[PDB]
Amino acid sequence: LPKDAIPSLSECQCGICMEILVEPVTLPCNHTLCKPCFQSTVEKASLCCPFCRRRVSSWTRYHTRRNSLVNVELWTIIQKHYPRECKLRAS
Numbered sequence: 001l002p003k004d005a006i007p008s009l010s011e012c013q014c015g016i017c018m019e020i021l022v023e024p025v026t027l028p029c030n031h032t033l034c035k036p037c038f039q040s041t042v043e044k045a046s047l048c049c050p051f052c053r054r055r056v057s058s059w060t061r062y063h064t065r066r067n068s069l070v071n072v073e074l075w076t077i078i079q080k081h082y083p084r085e086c087k088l089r090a091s
C-alpha cells in the first residue's frame with residue numbers, strides 16, 4: 001500500500017468476521033485480524049494464527065504485557081479513510 005494512497009474497503013475488512021478492521025492486530029506472520037476476533041479466536045482459544053496456524057502464545061504475552069497488540073500505524077490509516085464504518089462498529 002503506497003503512501004497516502006486510498007486503501008480498498010476490502011483490504012480494510014477483517015478476514016475472519018468480514019466487518020471493518022477495528023483495532024487491527026497484526027501477528028508476527030503478518031496476517032491481520034480485528035481485536036474482537038483476536039480476543040475470541042486467538043487470545044482465549046488457539047494461540048494460533050487463524051490464517052496460517054503460526055503459534056503465537058509467546059507473542060501474545062509479550063505484547064499484552066506492554067499494551068502493544070494493536071498495529072497503531074494501520075489503525076490510523078483505516079480510521080482516516082473509513083471513519084464512518086469505524087463509528088458504526090463502535091455503535
Ligand SMILES: [Zn+2]
Nearest residue numbers: 014017034037
Ligand atoms: Zn474481525
Ligand SMILES: [Zn+2]
Nearest residue numbers: 029031049052
Ligand atoms: Zn498467520
